[PDB]
Amino acid sequence: RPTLEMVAALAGVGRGTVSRVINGSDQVSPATREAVKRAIKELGYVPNRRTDTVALVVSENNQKLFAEPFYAGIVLGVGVALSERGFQFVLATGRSGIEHERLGGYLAGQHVDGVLLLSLHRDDPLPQMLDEAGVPYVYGGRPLGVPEEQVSYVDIDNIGGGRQATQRLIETGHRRIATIAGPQDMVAGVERLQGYREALLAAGMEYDETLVSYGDFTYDSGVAAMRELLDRAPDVDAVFAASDLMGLAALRVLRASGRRVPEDVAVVGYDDSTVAEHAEPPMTSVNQPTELMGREMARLLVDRITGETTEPVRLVLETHLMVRESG
């Protein structure tokens, strides 16, 4: 079956160019686009084409699975929902280009009935690799830069969650409200920042990028971000951290700097995890229904595998705020 690699080889370009032609990106010259399309035609290439087994792919290094509380709940829900339907799963990981290469090549070999895609980053190649092999998949987290109507996914209302977190800080009287945002190559990072922005504007407050710092959902990134916020805006009085681990980092940086939480700076996190429960002070945090998300991911994928559902399905789940001492 013709591959993207074969198209690139014949056209004399690389994977990045062919991937851009497949997606209809503007980032290709007309002459090179036409060369790629000629190769596609010559090869008969089509980009967008039992084992009782699903691959749950987490597009991160495996240590993220154990460090960040989100993953455990997804895996719990996936496991239960697949068990109820007679399916099992295997868990696959990897952040790097070579890991994506090897995993995409493997999943093109008819070793699983379908794939669940979790924690993907913008421009990760695995969806393309699965589409050209005809392997069905469902996302956990809407894909950035893909038209929504073409894909099936379960996601959280992270714009709403970001609004809930920021509205809490507005409602308790704060006027210099910062965020440690998630990474902007991940849908939840984009949308929790969007919710923060929408809350500020709905309240008649300014969106000041001085008060926006970015992490990558790790603790260490939260440490660096909180330190930077204090340098830029020593008068910050509240922080919305877009994950509990980044919020835990913020609490520790705030305390090290001599600021009381919540009296000087209030903090709200996201995940409503044991990280928040056991923080000092216990951390207010947005609760998202991670187990249900996993269950629904598995349900939607099995329906595609069995033919019960033949059109894309998208499901968005609501959040709520869990109030503790920190904000």
Add this chain to the structure above:
Amino acid sequence: RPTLEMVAALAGVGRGTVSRVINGSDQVSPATREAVKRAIKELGYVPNRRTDTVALVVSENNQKLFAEPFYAGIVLGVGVALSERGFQFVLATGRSGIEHERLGGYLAGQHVDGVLLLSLHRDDPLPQMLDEAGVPYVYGGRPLGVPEEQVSYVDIDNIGGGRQATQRLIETGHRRIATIAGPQDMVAGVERLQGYREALLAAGMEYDETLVSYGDFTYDSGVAAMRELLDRAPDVDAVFAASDLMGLAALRVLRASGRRVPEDVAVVGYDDSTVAEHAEPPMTSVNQPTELMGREMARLLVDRITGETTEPVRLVLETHLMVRESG
């Protein structure tokens, strides 16, 4: 290829009987053993017979992966060692009979080049299922009830670790030294209890089963075990818990009962994990080299896959005690 199921069907027995005949167990009558052997002959059954992919099988429910600190370090080491050799892994789980059935059936279908076996329990069927399909495997943890010379494994010197933990408590003057042992259907549970026993006897102390309680490496099992020890022996002055999570439970039960740690009861755990580091008081714990264990598991398996090694290899890794406040 003939299966155990086919042998059972032809002989008119079930899987448990055929499995016992395959292993040369005494737990079969002569007449039934001969019936099974006739079926084996009639079918031509043999019990003991690329994808760049290894299955790392954890014979537990997936939530154990996230709750117990051991697993993260194994996965880290496996991932690095396989990456260095051009292999990837998938992670498979399951405690139940139906999960073992489905996973054994899948792994017999040529979807991986080899298997790593972690956290298995005595009489788990997956090794049998892999042997009849000719799928190479390496254990992490020596198998109970299998002659050692027939298998490849990496294990920890858990007899020595159990001795280190118990010798510490003897050396600090304790005379009523209990253990919350691991489960006796798992090699580490057996061997850490053996080390406890050997330490007591080497010191001229009695092995008193009154002071031996059993858990299953979960926190909840440690809670029940510590409560039982206090009921049987209110004068206990030290506890060796065979995992950090069971030791954390012991600390909390001890404190709830009005006993000071270490002043009334000293505690030593096993795993030298963040569970021990963050306990109140910080927990003395046996350190085992989990990342190295994972690396070596992967190395041994790849050598079998590639044909570099054609004989069984067994490796046993040493432990050391990490001293903190609790004991």
